[PDB]
């Protein structure tokens, strides 16, 4: 059930993004692409490492839920890229914000694919 996982993930992703917009001031635009949405099915193995890498920097409880959902959509033990999180504070916030933005966009895109 691809549709079921999208609907499971969507409120988690919306909340994470909107809470970041409300709490964090002055986050610069990174202009980077981090998440690859699709492989074609939703690309858990491309998205998962990023969520694993920001887990200590974010809400561990929601991230855990996201990871549990996305693991179900890793149709193999495909390999996971090792992610370099920026050390600089502003780069690091832009990195997190870009992940949340692109995750939001991916799910909304795949949801339009499904309707």
């Amino acid at each position, epitope marked *: 059930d691809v549709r079921k996982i999208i609907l499971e993930l969507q409120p988690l992703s919306r909340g994470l993004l*909107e809470d970041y*917009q*409300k709490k964090e*001031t*002055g986050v610069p635009e990174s202009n980077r692409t981090l998440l690859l949405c699709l492989t074609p099915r939703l690309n858990s193995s491309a998205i998962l490492p990023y969520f694993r890498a920001i887990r200590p920097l974010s809400d561990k409880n929601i991230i855990d839920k996201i990871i549990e959902q996305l693991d179900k959509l890793k149709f193999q033990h495909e390999p996971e890229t090792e992610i370099s999180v920026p050390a600089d504070t502003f780069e690091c916030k832009s990195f997190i914000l870009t992940i949340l933005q692109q995750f*939001s*966009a991916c799910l*909304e895109s795949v949801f339009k694919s499904l309707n």
Partner: antibody
Amino acid sequence: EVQLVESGGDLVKPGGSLRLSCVASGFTFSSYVMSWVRQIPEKRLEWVATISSFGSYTYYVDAVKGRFTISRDNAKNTLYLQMNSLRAEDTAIYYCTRQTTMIAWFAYWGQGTLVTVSS
Amino acid sequence: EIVMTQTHKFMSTSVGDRVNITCKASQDVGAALAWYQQKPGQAPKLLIYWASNRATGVPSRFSGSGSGTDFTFTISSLEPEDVAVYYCQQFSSYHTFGGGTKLEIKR
């Protein structure tokens, strides 16, 4: 290319209402905070209102609170400003702008739509 | 509310000269300051953010400095296309703008 296009500006009497629209293209609209900024004839800039990606959080400048309402329709890539109880000093060019978080700077601006309130 | 004060509404300069535009905040904003340039009939354009980061494509003659409450926008060598109005803006807290400084050419 990122594009913001405002519409709805017009001539109104004090106490009237007006609804502004801003249609965005070139980015995933729901990924970004959006805001209105206005510029009065004397060319001072004043931030007006701000809305988070899915509408859960909004901020208003005091001068417009309880008269203006910011909202968005992500399906149509559209930002709105509902303006009630208009006054002469609301006369300004209204710009819609894109931001990363709710408190930030304004890297992208539309061309603006002129609102004139006069008896 | 954080008040941003640009002391000079207008400044005269000459092409080729250094220009120093000042902005002072009523409270500490750290480095959370942005500078915009505006030409007639156009929306303001972002030049500097986080007090000194030049936005993409902005010419190198423009720069910003300061942290805390006192900020400086500098054009190292004024060029004719630089005649415009410059505004500061803080984003430590709810957005406020300085009142603008209009550059005009001395003769």
